[model samples]
Target: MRIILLGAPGAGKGTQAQFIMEKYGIPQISTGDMLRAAVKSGSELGKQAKDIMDAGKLVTDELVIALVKERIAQEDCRNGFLLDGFPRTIPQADAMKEAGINVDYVLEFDVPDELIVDAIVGRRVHAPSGRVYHVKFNPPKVEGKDDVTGEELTTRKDDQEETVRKRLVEYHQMTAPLIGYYSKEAEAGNTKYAKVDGTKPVAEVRADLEKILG
Candidate 1:
């Protein structure tokens, strides 16, 4: 079952990706991981990619597809594979379509935007020590203070509600067309698209995925 797993940041995509990989026995191909591997592989394209990254320039769609083509051409993916996080841009998605890297399903793990804001805002960090605490799950021993060093804990400006909300809004806007593309592809009967509830427990989410994929 070739598939693409989609989710907003902090939607537990990593956890679900693990579950899906084991259950389906398909490799979860992460684009970043593939890129890193390519750089380390010492291939000619890898050399070019390393130069691009070292120059602080974004890797082009051509390079990304080249690396992906190298990866999926391996023996294990002969049957099918799962893309954990990929096609993050319109150009990349277009490149995949052009390269004939079609997927059978696009499963988007979704959680409420409000929940993401709540979770992000609750994070408190001890900047000096890099210690982290969550208001709901792992609060500091003393309110607004680090337990170990007694340092003041502060939320990163980016972790603030407004900041995270804006981040989410921007991310959704960027990915909206990509999601629409897959949804339309599914409607055309060439693929399946699912919006899986990410708020469910791990096992329940796995069960839902199995039922859908089957």
Candidate 2:
């Protein structure tokens, strides 16, 4: 099944996405991963994309949609694929539609905004391996060390309150139309959007997601 998992930062999109990929045996496509692969491969577009990414902004629509077209046309994705961190804006959603890509389900994680704040505020990272730890829900064994490596873990500047608050403020202006687009369609008897509770346990969240999209 084709699906898009939607949520704001720290809304547990990654948690549910991992479970979905494992259960469905479908590739989870991330736009950043797509660009980074091309960058590593030294493609012409990758050269240009590197500069954009370094600035912490999105790449151009032409490049993004081109990658989308090429990726979805691949043999493995001939059946379907799961998308993450894609179609992030209404324009991107429209462009994805214009490129003839339509997902059967856009599973939105409906966790409260305050919950995201709490999660982000308490988040820490295993710098080398890119694993996350939440102070409340999933604390590391040591106070501030990677459990596996014994190396010191740290909080990123982005994990701070100011950065997180800015993201939440901009999120509405930037992504609301995209979410509303699918919401409107769903309200009109379309099956494109399904809201899933994300405050539950990881497995419970996965089960609810499967009930909707599987």
Candidate 3:
């Protein structure tokens, strides 16, 4: 079940990663989470990553791959693991392949750019508890307030229309090539590839994944 979950921002990869982790009893190896954990652990890699981050520079792909390798070598990943937010570039993907870190499936959530923009722009968050609400799709009980705490919700800067549109453009530019790469791999029978309609309801999307994975 070594799987790569690919999607743009607000495409629900996080939700599906959680579901897959629980259902398959496999760990979800998110690069961001891994990096944070590494930094907290104060390991050699963590020290280097922290320095790079402290200097306000992006962590090198080699460092990220090393962290991923260490994470996947953990006991819980023996059966398999779900990958989220790694291999953002073809070179990174090539590095993984060259390292012999094989993936069984590449699942892409295909949603319209307009839908993603709407979904992200309407989002609001309770900064303290991290509870998310959407202005349209999943509104809180009171407008602009948290449902449980009644605290005012704040829109994340990243969720603003302009910021989200910018991110989407960048995401497409980076991800389009990876899509082609994986599709070629699938055509070569090296791995399985799937694209789900992300506009579907969450449960419906989960069901689609179930059918595919089964």
Candidate 4:
């Protein structure tokens, strides 16, 4: 069940990843979390990463891929693992292939730009506990108030329409090519590539994945 989840931000990949992890008993290999863990562990790769971060430069793709390789080699990943946020570019995908790190599935959550924009823009959060509500879809009991704590629900800066639109553009620019790359790989019988309607309700989306993964 080595899997790569492909989707723009706010496309619910995180939620699906959690479900998949629990059901399959496989770890979710998130690159951001892996990098942070690496740096905290003070391993050789972590030291290198920290040095690069200290210089305020982006970590190189090679270093990120190395971290991923190290992570997936762990005992927990022996059965399989879900890749949440790596391979953002074609070159990164290529590097993974070159490293002999093969995946069984590449599932893309496809949602219209407008729907994504609306979904994100309407979102409100109880930051302290990470409880989320959407103004339009899942409104809080009272307007702008947390249901449990009565604290004000706040909009994240990233959830603003302008910021979300900008992120969508960047996501499309980076991910379009990876979609094509994996599609070709699927055509060549190297892996399975499937797209699900992200606009569906959460349970419905999970049902779709169950059909695919089963």
Candidate 5:
């Protein structure tokens, strides 16, 4: 069940990861949570990260790799786990292998910038029941209102139209190279790398993954 997902922030990786985890029974691991744990524990690395962060400087990949190495060694990940967000840069990717991170599959959700923007900003949430809808593809009966509860629908900060567009642009600049690297891996057959069509229906997306990974 070990996997690494590469995609823009709004590419529905979280949703798809949930489906994959349920079917495969694997825990989904996130790097952000792991780093936060270090910060809370005041580890030596955490102290340095805190200093760098307080100075408005990003933590180096070296520190991140150290954190990741420690976190993955936990007993819970012995059976392998789904990695949602880590190994973002070439250094990080190489660090994982150099440190024997033991990745089995690397999956990229291939979605265009425009579609990703819409997938994020198009969301409408029913405040009461927490029902969710997408504007372009899954709007409710009435605009800005929940169908079942008659409550107002709200869009989250991350789902704001401008925010979505900006995030897509950032991903294109910072994260797109990951696809290129994994594409070469796919060609070599050294690792399992599949670029899933992220814009497809949820069931269809799952079907394609099942056909490939299962």
Candidate 6:
């Protein structure tokens, strides 16, 4: 299935993305990863994206859509790919449809605002690869190693205790409406919009997700 996983930061979206890719044998296409790669590559689009990123603004839809289109056209996506990012807003969603892409499922990992607040404050990501871990709930296989690549993990500045609540507010402001947007689609049978309680134990969460697709 071509799936899109949605959740606020630290809601275990990345963890589940990896799980679905492993279990379903589909490639995970992350818009965040694509954006960062462009920033690192220093191409013209990369430069423009960087300036916007540096200003803490969202990357433009054109650039983001370009990156997503290029990725989905790759050979690995012929079997169908899971989209872990992109189409973050109503406009972006419209852009996706206008460009002729169709998704089978939209899964939102739902966790309460407070739980995410507690989790984001302690989160660490394997910077080089974007593997997420919470110092408490999830930890590395080796003290600080990125399980797959062995790179060191680092915490983001925005995840600092003082900064997290602010970001959470911004996330809710941006994401809450999108939930209704997709839910309406589900009601009309154009796609499936499923929500899993994200506060559940990891194993239980995966089981619920399995039933969702099964």
Tens-place lDDT digits, model 6, residues 12-130? 67767778887777898888877787777756766777888889997778778877887788788887788985567888887887777778899988888788778787677988777
lDDT, residue 111, candidate 4: 87
lDDT values, one for every candidate? 0.84, 0.80, 0.87, 0.89, 0.78, 0.81
Candidate 1 TM-score, true structure as reference: 0.90
Worst 10 residues of 4 by lDDT: 9-18
lDDT of 1: 0.84
Each candidate: RMSD: 1.9, 3.9, 2.6, 2.5, 3.3, 6.3
TM-score of 5: 0.79
lDDT of model 4, residue 113: 89
Cα lDDT tens digits, model 2, 1-214, are: 7888788876768887777776767888878778888678666766777778889886788789877777777687765688887888888888887888878888877777788889888888988899899889799999988899988888889888888888888877787788889888677765479878888988788778767765
| Candidate 6 residue-pair clash tally | 0
- Candidate order, TM-score descending: 1, 4, 3, 5, 2, 6
Off by over 4 Å in 1: none
Name the runs in model 6 displaced over 4 angstroms. Answer: 38-58, 120-157, 160-162
- Candidate 3: give the clashing pairs: none
Model 3 Cα lDDT, one tens digit per residue, 1-214: 7999888887767767778888888987888998778778858988998888889999888988888888898899988999987788999998898778889999998888899888888889999999999888799999888999999889888778998888889999999999999999999999998987888888998999999998
User: Which ranges in model 4 have alpha carbons more than 4 Å from their true place?
Assistant: 124-133, 140-156
lDDT of 4 by residue, 58-149 (tens): 98999999999989988999889999867899999999999999999999988888988988888899999999999887999998899999
**Which model, 1 or 6, shows the larger TM-score?**
1
lDDT: which is higher, 3 or 4? Answer: 4
Expressed as tens digits, the lDDT of each residue in 26-135 for candidate 1 is 88787788877777787898898889988999888898898888888888787678888788877788899899888888988898899888878889999987899998
Error of 1 at 202 (Å): 2.2
Number of backbone clashes in candidate 2: 0
Full-model lDDT, candidate 5: 0.78
Runs with alpha carbons beyond 4 Å of true place in candidate 2: 41-58, 123-135, 138-156, 187-191
Top candidate when judged by lDDT against the true structure? 4
